[PDB]
Ligand binder design. Structure first.
Ligand SMILES: [Mg+2]
Length: 59
RNA sequence: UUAAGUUAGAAAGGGCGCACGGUGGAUGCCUUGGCACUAGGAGCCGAAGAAGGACGGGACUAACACCGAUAUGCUUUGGG
């Protein structure tokens, strides 16, 4: 959270993209039954949320 | 032995009493919920989109509760 606030808006935007891609691949693996660490999903969801929050605080 | 006479016992099933079960949810005990008030506060919400909803959100989710594509939560300030 404090680490996110360090980054620029554009850099956060790119951090989101990565997390969105990560979340997508987790959901993919999960559906194909190839995901063990299913707790990863919630973390990534929360992370995305956190990043959007900081960006909206910037404005 | 014949004759005459008298009387017993019997239960297919049934009755009464008793014993033991079943069913059923009365009664007692209990209380998560109600009822009536008192004192104090407050008596409004809505185009800055209401009341009330629908559909969604969990690793798996039928329902309830919570939340809204930032979805079973996000940030922050305090408590602990
Ligand atoms: Mg704290």
């Amino acid at each position: 959270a404090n680490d996110i606030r360090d980054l620029s808006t554009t850099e956060i935007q790119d951090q989101e993209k990565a997390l969105k891609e990560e979340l997508f691949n987790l959901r993919f693996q999960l559906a194909t039954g190839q995901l063990e660490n299913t707790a990863r999903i919630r973390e990534v969801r929360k992370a995305i949320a956190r990043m959007k929050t900081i960006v909206r605080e910037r404005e």
